[PDB]
């Protein structure tokens, strides 16, 4: 999962509207604090500094950010 691969924060690389009520909506260029794994294609997290914006999101829609 993201934890085991040392993923703590990521930046979004596309826009994304939730299709289900557990999915995070975001625009490109936002930072997500990654806090878990949904499945092999989806991680879970919240927007850095806006933790009420939270949910699952595609692994392929983000890129790892260094500390």
């Amino acid at each position: 999962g993201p934890g085991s691969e040392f993923v703590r924060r990521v930046k979004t690389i596309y826009d994304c509207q939730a299709d289900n009520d557990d999915e995070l909506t975001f625009i490109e260029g936002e930072v997500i604090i990654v806090t878990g794994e949904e499945d092999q294609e989806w991680w879970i997290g919240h927007i850095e500094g806006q933790p009420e914006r939270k949910g699952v999101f595609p692994v392929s829609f983000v890129h790892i950010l260094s500390d």
């Binding site: 499945d39 294609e41 989806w42 829609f61």
Partner: peptide, 13 residues
């Protein structure tokens, strides 16, 4: 509906 065209998302499980 003028928004960007993001790539297909993976399916949910």
């Amino acid at each position: 509906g003028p928004g960007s065209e993001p790539p297909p998302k993976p399916p949910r499980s």
